[PDB]
Amino acid sequence: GSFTMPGLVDSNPAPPESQEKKPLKPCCACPETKKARDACIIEKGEEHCGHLIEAHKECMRALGFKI
Template identity: 35%
Template sequence: MGNRISSGSVEVAPPPQQSPKKPGCKICCACPQERRARDECILLKNMDECEAEVSAFYACLLKEGFSAEEVNALKRNTKRM
């Protein structure tokens, strides 16, 4: 009268795929602190000296849920000074 466990193989359903995180805003409004740090660095220094700030901004965009394609498109469209 209890639960019976079958001796057959047990099928385990794969874990549900996590849906990608949806950004809460447009890419132009995301990561304001990182964007500000990046912009200030670029205005005050040479672009080559701001690699850490630029990388932090793009990493933040990815963390906020923007796709790698969107971030790469933004990188391609960014003008070098």
């Protein structure tokens, strides 16, 4: 004897989307730095990860990006 839920389908517990996109966008615009930034920002936030901005921020400024 257990309750059950046959009036719906519900879901599994899940993020605000999961990684399901890997398109070809070829360049040299600091992948390591950008990609490594975002992982901290994902988890904590830009406010907790702006050492992860500043470190990577360099890398883009060198390019003539607007830092």
